[PDB]
Amino acid sequence: AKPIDVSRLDLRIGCIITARKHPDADSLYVEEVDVGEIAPRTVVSGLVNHVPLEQMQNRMVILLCNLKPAKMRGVLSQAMVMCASSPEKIEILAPPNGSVPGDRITFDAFPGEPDKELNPKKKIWEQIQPDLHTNDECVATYKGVPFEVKGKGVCRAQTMSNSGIKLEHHHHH
Ligand SMILES: [Hg+2]
Numbered sequence: 001a002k003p004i005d006v007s008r009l010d011l012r013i014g015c016i017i018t019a020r021k022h023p024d025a026d027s028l029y030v031e032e033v034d035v036g037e038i039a040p041r042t043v044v045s046g047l048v049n050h051v052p053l054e055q056m057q058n059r060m061v062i063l064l065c066n067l068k069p070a071k072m073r074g075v076l077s078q079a080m081v082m083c084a085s086s087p088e089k090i091e092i093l094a095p096p097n098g099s100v101p102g103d104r105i106t107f108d109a110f111p112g113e114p115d116k117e118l119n120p121k122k123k124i125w126e127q128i129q130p131d132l133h134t135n136d137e138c139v140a141t142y143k144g145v146p147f148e149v150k151g152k153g154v155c156r157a158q159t160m161s162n163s164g165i166k167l168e169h170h171h172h173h
């Protein structure tokens with residue numbers, strides 16, 4: 001059986017092309033994200049109170065691309081934006097300069113291919129998530145190993161140090 005480490009996740013850099021308030025939701029954003037594929041992916045983000053819409057535009061992000069696509073009040077989200085989060089504040093993790101859509105986040109320390117699709121019932125993300133935190137310098141890591149785009153740099157939060165990393169739970173215990 002494949003190991004239960006960050007190698008099971010499919011993380012890629014993306015660029016938010018379009019962002020708008022969700023038509024039928026008051027706390028969600030609807031973005032079209034270029035992840036380097038033929039067409040953009042639709043992403044529904046609950047960041048209304050944390051990131052103004054104007055700052056969501058043309059925003060480079062790190063996306064978890066192998067989660068089961070799910071309906072969000074009618075809109076099927078095809079990926080989720082990775083953020084440093086706490087009951088305090090929420091910050092979108094920023095890729096290093098030069099990163100372009102489609103760039104992959106990898107870890108030599110953890111060999112393995114991501115799962116085509118993460119089966120929620122197997123809660124693979126639920127077991128990995130606790131090892132996902134930003135370090136003392138705000139750099140995103142997995143068990144202390146930095147989220148890196150080979151040849152470009154590491155991903156980091158703006159001000160959130162020693163923080164947990166989530167892409168949904170953002171508002172509840
Ligand atoms: Hg961009």
Ligand SMILES: [Hg+2]
Pocket residue numbers: 136137138139158159161
């Ligand atoms: Hg820092």
